Design a protein around this nucleic acid. Structure first.
Ligand code: MG
Ligand code: MG
Ligand code: MG
Ligand code: MG
Ligand code: MG
Ligand code: MG
Ligand code: MG
Ligand code: MG
Ligand code: MG
Ligand code: MG
Ligand code: MG
Ligand code: MG
Ligand code: MG
Ligand code: MG
Ligand code: MG
Ligand code: MG
Ligand code: MG
Ligand code: MG
Ligand code: MG
Ligand code: MG
Ligand code: MG
Ligand code: MG
Ligand code: MG
Ligand code: MG
Ligand code: MG
Ligand code: MG
Ligand code: MG
Ligand code: MG
Ligand code: MG
Ligand code: MG
Ligand code: MG
Ligand code: MG
Ligand code: MG
Lengths: 76, 188, 136, 30, 44, 181, 98
RNA sequence: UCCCCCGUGCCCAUAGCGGCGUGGAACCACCCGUUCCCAUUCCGAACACGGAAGUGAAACGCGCCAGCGCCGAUGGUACUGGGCGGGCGACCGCCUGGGAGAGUAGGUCGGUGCGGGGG
RNA sequence: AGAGCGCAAGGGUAGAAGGGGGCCUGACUGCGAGGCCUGCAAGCCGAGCAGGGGCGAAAGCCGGGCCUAGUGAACCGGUGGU
């Protein structure tokens, strides 16, 4: 045939879940676009990687129209 | 028509059916209650009954209820009724599929042709007093090639058609035979 | 037709969606067993129908072969099947209504439909219309 | 500037535009 | 294409890629050297 | 220069002629001209960007306003076009300079046309605006004979607070448009 | 439009929402992340005259004096739907003057 | 406290689409004008400044209808963690805990913050 | 939002990542908390510190391009430098 070809698995998804402590920089979610959005103490980078901006717990916001966000609710 | 209803609570919906009682439910803007007619009976009732004529339903509450079958879930795999929706009427206008009696033999069917009958019934907004045991259809001037729509109905007094005013009701399609066994063979 | 080439086999689960109610003509023919029915099978019945009752009513065929059917040519294992020898089939679960006639007598249809189920690779029952629908 | 339309047929409209010397003919007057 | 930038009156290169026939014969973009800071960069 | 015939024509003549005809209730609801767009389908000057300057500077003295262009978005392969590049002149005129263009239209442009017959009455866009074609733009005053290098065509457009063609029909007749009955 | 507002909010704190009417020029200092305004140095519908630019500048010193007596200091400026240039401009401009 | 307006966030179409109505004192819009700051691949359409008079027509604000849209049970089923049964087989069935989609009944012309002006 | 987003497909997307402009070269140097991914080697994301810059009034944004391909250990050797 002319098939049987493919690209190695990219292991993407939500890396931290709601209610996990995390340090600064922790990748929070790896993603195909903005399947999720940044938000509170949560930056994002070239690939759309979301990541903690300060240690603290993670939470997930649904906002319909506006899309889904992820934040760290800091504390120490 | 009339059929003896019963009340239902905990009983295993499935264990019921083995007994013979087709479970169901009566509900309307104010009412919603678990029940279960009897199957052998519901058959006979609903055979003629269906969802045109109303059915008043008797509970051991003596209460005669002004309801008709909103919908019935048939079980796939050899037809049978699963359970029954019973819309309690009151008096305010209510929508419902009222029949259609197509009367007269059209120009089509005569010179060979076929009774195509898109809607063997139609949905109309109406109050319970008007249970128009049917509607007439002047199907006779119809020809193979022609079709009577919705905007062409003998509407009884006080009744308003709920469907789109342009839906087709029936039509007259050609027969079908062997001027299409030769031609349908090689040509394709 | 269209779409793309060849397609998985899949299984034939419970009779689920596979089934319903007469929905045009007077009488119906319904599937008891699950099956891939071939176009050459449909069409085999279709004709057997009319040819039986000439200048006849209207036969509605409500099953339709969108499944392309593969088949390697007497060799061994290299790639997917050339396929398509039996061309296409219709996935048909227990209870599906295949054909129904209209414009006919009870004994016209109780025949036509009878013959057809013969042409089919499956066990079938015939149907009326009782009342069973959805309305109010 | 004040554009005079001395359109040939008998008329001279003092309209606005470019060049007061607007030679014309067969306008609305005829 | 292999393009290696150069500092004026000094010695320091940079990572680059000029384009073949494409409109680009001479390039003069700024940057930032180690010794001192910021100085005009010619191709060569 | 905020004044002219058509400046007042609309007012001390057409303003009340409309209040009678249709009878409003408020000073603004009354149909007004307010936007004259002038367009050119120059797929021709695809090649010569020179002839692009002529239709432009000509447009200048006829429209009494600086001209503008617009290249296409998904250009016709077939008729020598592809992407963002081509040409289509366009020049919206508003305020008073709009009027000073219109006065030249129904009192100079129309009266000297090769067998002008009357503005096609079907040209109303169901709503309250007008669009009509012209071949020779030399029927304009400033345009001299020995100057035009080719018969470039174009089409004008006039936006009106009109909400229906009847209302627009009346509003153009009243200002002065030579309708083909 | 209002793209800007999104861009500002991201920064963190203390938006100065300069609204401006054809005769007026209000101005809130909204602390988002709770949905409350801190100061509200309006203008035409407050007290001050009728000259616009000089008005804006004056209402600038409005929020200014009103602010420090509370704590504010982040110039964070909602250059709202109006492009910073004139009335809006002077506004924050005075808020800077002191 | 209450009522209307203005700026602005929160809920995310039960906010919306479309239709009738209404408010100009205030507030806001449209509005007068293009000298100044400032502006258009052309235009004071948009941005901008200075601002009589006029207007609530457009816009927007508030209401009122359910045609579209949107939300949408209950009952039942499909499916199905776990446990099993029949038959010779594609498959079919029970026990147990979970349980839809679609469809009916139905709802819906919003809910609510903080601040500001006005009786 | 079915367009567009250089190119496949996909996920994303106008409350722009898309079209147009004005100024510009951060297609920076020195680094790098902390993670994703993973047998190894490799690949990936990255706040922030310093230096000196760019656009912006400013909050701020810039360590190339909506993203995910556009590649090759080590040896040996070429050129330029301290
Ligand atoms: Mg493989
Ligand atoms: Mg970054
Ligand atoms: Mg990027
Ligand atoms: Mg970057
Ligand atoms: Mg005919
Ligand atoms: Mg309806
Ligand atoms: Mg058989
Ligand atoms: Mg009124
Ligand atoms: Mg809040
Ligand atoms: Mg109104
Ligand atoms: Mg009124
Ligand atoms: Mg008034
Ligand atoms: Mg000037
Ligand atoms: Mg109104
Ligand atoms: Mg209310
Ligand atoms: Mg919906
Ligand atoms: Mg829905
Ligand atoms: Mg449900
Ligand atoms: Mg549902
Ligand atoms: Mg509010
Ligand atoms: Mg609100
Ligand atoms: Mg009072
Ligand atoms: Mg740029
Ligand atoms: Mg590290
Ligand atoms: Mg690391
Ligand atoms: Mg950084
Ligand atoms: Mg720095
Ligand atoms: Mg410095
Ligand atoms: Mg950035
Ligand atoms: Mg870009
Ligand atoms: Mg070696
Ligand atoms: Mg070697
Ligand atoms: Mg070498």
């Amino acid at each position: 045939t002319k098939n049987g070809r493919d690209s190695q698995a990219k292991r993407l998804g939500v890396k931290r879940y709601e209610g996990q402590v995390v340090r600064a920089g922790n990748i929070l979610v790896r993603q195909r676009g903005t399947r999720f959005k940044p938000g509170k103490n949560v930056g994002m980078g070239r690939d759309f990687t979301l990541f903690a901006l300060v240690d603290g717990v993670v939470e997930f916001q649904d906002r319909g129209r506006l899309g889904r966000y992820v934040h760290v609710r800091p504390l120490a | 028509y009339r059929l003896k209803a019963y009340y239902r609570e905990g009983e295993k919906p499935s264990a019921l059916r083995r007994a013979g009682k087709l479970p169901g439910v009566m509900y309307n803007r104010h009412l919603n209650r678990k029940v279960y007619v009897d199957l052998v009976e519901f058959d006979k009732v609903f055979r003629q009954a269906s969802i045109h004529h109303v059915i008043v339903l008797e509970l051991p509450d003596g209460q005669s209820l002004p309801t008709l079958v909103r919908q019935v879930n048939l079980d796939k795999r050899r037809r049978r009724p699963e359970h029954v929706d019973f819309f309690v009427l009151s008096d305010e206008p209510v929508e419902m599929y009222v029949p259609l009696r197509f009367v007269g033999t059209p120009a089509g069917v005569r010179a060979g042709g076929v009774l195509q009958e898109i809607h063997r019934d139609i949905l109309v907004k109406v109050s319970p007093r008007n249970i128009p045991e049917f509607i007439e259809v002047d199907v006779s001037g119809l020809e193979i090639g022609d079709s009577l729509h919705a905007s062409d109905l003998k509407l009884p007094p006080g009744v308003e058609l709920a469907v789109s005013p342009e839906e087709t009701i029936a039509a007259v399609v050609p027969p079908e035979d062997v001027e299409k066994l030769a031609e349908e063979a090689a040509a394709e | 037709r269209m779409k793309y080439r060849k397609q998985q086999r899949g299984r034939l689960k419970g009779a689920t969606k596979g089934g319903d109610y007469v929905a045009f003509g007077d009488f119906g023919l319904v599937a008891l067993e699950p099956a891939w029915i071939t176009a050459q099978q449909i069409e085999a019945a279709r004709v057997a129908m009319v040819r039986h009752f000439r200048r006849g009513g209207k036969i509605f065929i409500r099953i339709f072969p969108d499944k392309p059917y593969t088949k390697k040519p007497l060799e061994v294992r290299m790639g997917k099947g050339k396929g398509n020898v039996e061309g296409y089939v219709a996935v048909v679960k227990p209870g599906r209504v295949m054909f129904e006639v209209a414009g006919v007598t009870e004994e016209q249809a109780m025949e036509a439909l009878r013959i057809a189920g013969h042409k089919l690779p499956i066990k079938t029952k015939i149907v009326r219309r009782d009342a069973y629908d959805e309305a109010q | 500037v004040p554009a005079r339309i001395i359109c040939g047929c008998g008329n001279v409209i003092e309209t606005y535009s470019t060049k007061p010397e607007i030679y014309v003919e067969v306008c609305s007057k005829c | 294409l292999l393009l290696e930038c150069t500092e004026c009156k000094r010695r320091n290169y940079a990572t680059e890629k000029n384009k073949r026939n494409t409109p680009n014969k001479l390039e003069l973009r700024k940057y930032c050297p180690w010794c001192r800071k910021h100085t005009v960069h010619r191709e060569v | 220069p905020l004044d002219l015939a058509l400046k007042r024509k609309y007012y001390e003549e057409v303003r009340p002629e409309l209040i009678r005809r249709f009878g409003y209730q408020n000073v603004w609801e009354v149909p007004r001209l307010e936007k004259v767009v002038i367009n050119q389908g120059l797929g021709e000057a695809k090649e010569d960007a020179r002839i692009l300057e002529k239709a432009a500077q000509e447009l200048a003295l006829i429209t009494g306003q600086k001209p503008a262009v617009t290249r296409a978005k998904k250009s016709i392969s077939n008729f020598k076009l592809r992407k963002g590049m081509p040409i289509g002149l366009r020049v919206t005129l508003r305020r008073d300079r709009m009027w000073i263009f219109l006065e030249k239209l129904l009192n100079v442009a129309l009266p000297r046309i090769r067998d002008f017959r009357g503005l096609n009455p079907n040209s109303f866009d169901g709503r309250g605006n007008y669009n009509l074609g012209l071949r020779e733009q030399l029927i304009f005053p400033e345009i001299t004979y020995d100057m035009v290098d080719a018969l470039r065509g174009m089409d004008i457009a006039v936006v009106t607070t009109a909400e229906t063609d009847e209302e627009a029909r009346a509003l153009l007749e009243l200002l002065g448009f030579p309708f083909r009955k | 439009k209002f793209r800007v507002r999104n861009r500002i909010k991201r920064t963190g704190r203390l938006r100065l929402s300069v609204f401006r009417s054809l005769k007026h020029i209000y101005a809130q200092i909204i602390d988002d992340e709770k949905g409350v305004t801190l100061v509200s140095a309006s203008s035409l519908a407050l007290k001050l005259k009728g000259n616009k630019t000089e008005v804006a500048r004056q209402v600038g010193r409005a929020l200014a004096e009103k602010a420090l007596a509370l704590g504010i200091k982040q110039v964070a400026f909602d250059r709202g739907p109006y492009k910073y240039h004139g009335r809006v401009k002077a506004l924050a401009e005075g808020a800077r003057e002191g």
